[PDB]
Design a protein around this ligand. Structure first.
Ligand SMILES: CCCCCCCC(=O)OC[C@H](COP(=O)(O)O[C@@H]1[C@H](O)[C@H](O)[C@@H](OP(=O)(O)O)[C@H](OP(=O)(O)O)[C@H]1O)OC(=O)CCCCCCC
Ligand SMILES: CCCCCCCC(=O)OC[C@H](COP(=O)(O)O[C@@H]1[C@H](O)[C@H](O)[C@@H](OP(=O)(O)O)[C@H](OP(=O)(O)O)[C@H]1O)OC(=O)CCCCCCC
Ligand SMILES: CCCCCCCC(=O)OC[C@H](COP(=O)(O)O[C@@H]1[C@H](O)[C@H](O)[C@@H](OP(=O)(O)O)[C@H](OP(=O)(O)O)[C@H]1O)OC(=O)CCCCCCC
Ligand SMILES: CCCCCCCC(=O)OC[C@H](COP(=O)(O)O[C@@H]1[C@H](O)[C@H](O)[C@@H](OP(=O)(O)O)[C@H](OP(=O)(O)O)[C@H]1O)OC(=O)CCCCCCC
Ligand SMILES: CCCCCCCC(=O)OC[C@H](COP(=O)(O)O[C@@H]1[C@H](O)[C@H](O)[C@@H](OP(=O)(O)O)[C@H](OP(=O)(O)O)[C@H]1O)OC(=O)CCCCCCC
Ligand SMILES: CCCCCCCC(=O)OC[C@H](COP(=O)(O)O[C@@H]1[C@H](O)[C@H](O)[C@@H](OP(=O)(O)O)[C@H](OP(=O)(O)O)[C@H]1O)OC(=O)CCCCCCC
Ligand SMILES: *C(=O)CCCCCCCCCCCCC
Ligand SMILES: *C(=O)CCCCCCCCCCCCC
Ligand SMILES: *C(=O)CCCCCCCCCCCCC
Lengths: 115, 115, 115
């Protein structure tokens, strides 16, 4: 229906704060958390993966390489899955952009220890 | 409708015998052979591939790597495609689990001659 | 509805000339340009990619490796995307087959400078 699950009380507060973009006027809302869950199940991917910091990582991994080959439907996903994942880990970005940079750098560190 | 095609007379006998799980009470039935064919065509994959030992291998190959990234919809597939494939090859497992081990080991042998 | 967009006036002329096959009697028509656009959006891929020589390349890249693992739905795509791409680049093949050879050879050249 429209209840909490993916994000807890504390996460919800920050979530509503985070904005979809750095230079916008539309904060994040449950509409985005559910909008992704629906598109997820469509790709044979349960929405529960978003409720777990581990499940999200698995999703971003498939969408990562499918960022250029993927379509708009995939782009939006990476946006939500990003801001959400950051919440489950620790990163408390203000927008969806900052979340992309953080996750982008974290991957660059592993490159040195996984080349 | 509900006739034979993927599995012949002899294969049908063994199929009905094989169980979906090692510790269960629900043997295999045509319902599972058709249930997969439907999900197959959905992924741009003709159900006929299951009627051929060659087609199955091609399917298990894509689902193999998509076992962790894939969703529940993919899991069930690997289960049926497994028990079925084993029938077309030679392996006559009793459950779906044994089929996974057999196919798992067969792949380990090639690793030594394809590393 | 049924207007021009992907192929311009000049491209349209050649398009209608090109045949789906070398030994057939069914030339190409808008029906094929739209038929693909529909299947594209289904895979999270905007149909606009076909209107751009760059977008097409990105599509053929994903379908390339998915030529054997992919289903019939993918085959038809590679057929249209091929004849179309050739138009945006320069190749003016007469059928869909010739388009496959041209794109096949072009990739062989890069192999020598990208092995
Ligand atoms: C007399 C009254 C006259 C005024 C009323 C006349 C109509 C009127 O309202 O103004 C037109 C428009 C603003 O209205 P408008 O609804 O088109 O605003 C843009 C629209 O929402 C886009 O979808 C946004 O980009 P995206 O979805 O996030 O990609 C874009 O954001 P930004 O990201 O740009 O901030 C928004 O500016 O002005 C411009 O700034 C366009 C500059 C080009 C910018 C577009 C290039 C991104
Ligand atoms: C049962 C029916 C249920 C469906 C109807 C329920 C409501 C519904 O329509 O879906 C919600 C929404 C799409 O609708 P929605 O109008 O909110 O679409 C977004 C909105 O226009 C933003 O302003 C765009 O960013 P910007 O102005 O250019 O910055 C953003 O573009 P992209 O640039 O993201 O492509 C658009 O996706 O889904 C998502 O994809 C959000 C993922 C987070 C992405 C936002 C992070 C940028
Ligand atoms: C007074 C009468 C009181 C009795 C009636 C009260 C209700 C009652 O019938 O008993 C409860 C239940 C058995 O009934 P219940 O329908 O829940 O049985 C389980 C259910 O079908 C699961 O979906 C099966 O796992 P999966 O889909 O294949 O994954 C699981 O199989 P196994 O694979 O476990 O054999 C089944 O046991 O007992 C337990 O054994 C649970 C232990 C935890 C096991 C679950 C962890 C897998
Ligand atoms: C037009 C509508 C047609 C659709 C309605 C037609 C009937 C229909 O509903 O679909 C059939 C069936 C799903 O329904 P169905 O209730 O049989 O689902 C399975 C059943 O509950 C088993 O007991 C589960 O295993 P276990 O108790 O935990 O061991 C198994 O889980 P997984 O662990 O497999 O996820 C479940 O999938 O499809 C398949 O996926 C079978 C693939 C073989 C998988 C079985 C091998 C484990
Ligand atoms: C008294 C009147 C009797 C005559 C009326 C009796 C019925 C009658 O019309 O003739 C039968 C048939 C021609 O008619 P028919 O509609 O079946 O023609 C074939 C049909 O359209 C296939 O789908 C085409 O292959 P694909 O979709 O592109 O793959 C095939 O093309 P090609 O690519 O073969 O040119 C077509 O020939 O004859 C043969 O040539 C078959 C030889 C085997 C060829 C099939 C192997 C590809
Ligand atoms: C809203 C509903 C809209 C849908 C209804 C609108 C009309 C509609 O039905 O779809 C159009 C068409 C499929 O229908 P359509 O009857 O034209 O199908 C093709 C036709 O039979 C050819 O003769 C076949 O080649 P050949 O005789 O064996 O040589 C070709 O096979 P393949 O060998 O290609 O598999 C068939 O796909 O789509 C495409 O895939 C064309 C892609 C270009 C492929 C052609 C290049 C070979
Ligand atoms: C929002 O309220 C989340 C609930 C998701 C919808 C559940 C629908 C009801 C479950 C039982 C119906 C199954 C019919 C046998
Ligand atoms: C079970 O009976 C397997 C048959 C699959 C359904 C076939 C449907 C009938 C074929 C002709 C209908 C096409 C309409 C032009
Ligand atoms: C063929 O004519 C190409 C046009 C594609 C269909 C567009 C449908 C009309 C657009 C506005 C409808 C949206 C409802 C708010």
């Amino acid at each position: 229906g429209a209840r909490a699950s993916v994000l807890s009380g504390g996460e919800l507060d920050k979530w509503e704060k985070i904005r979809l973009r750095p230079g916008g006027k539309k904060q994040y809302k449950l509409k985005h958390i559910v909008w992704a869950s629906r598109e997820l199940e469509r790709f044979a991917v349960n929405p529960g993966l978003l409720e777990t910091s581990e499940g999200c990582r698995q999703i971003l991994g498939q969408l990562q390489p499918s960022l250029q080959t993927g379509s708009e439907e995939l782009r939006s996903l990476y946006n939500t899955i990003a801001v959400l994942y950051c919440v489950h880990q620790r990163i408390d970005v203000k927008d969806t952009k900052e979340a992309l940079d953080k996750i982008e750098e974290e991957q660059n560190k592993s490159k040195k220890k996984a080349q």
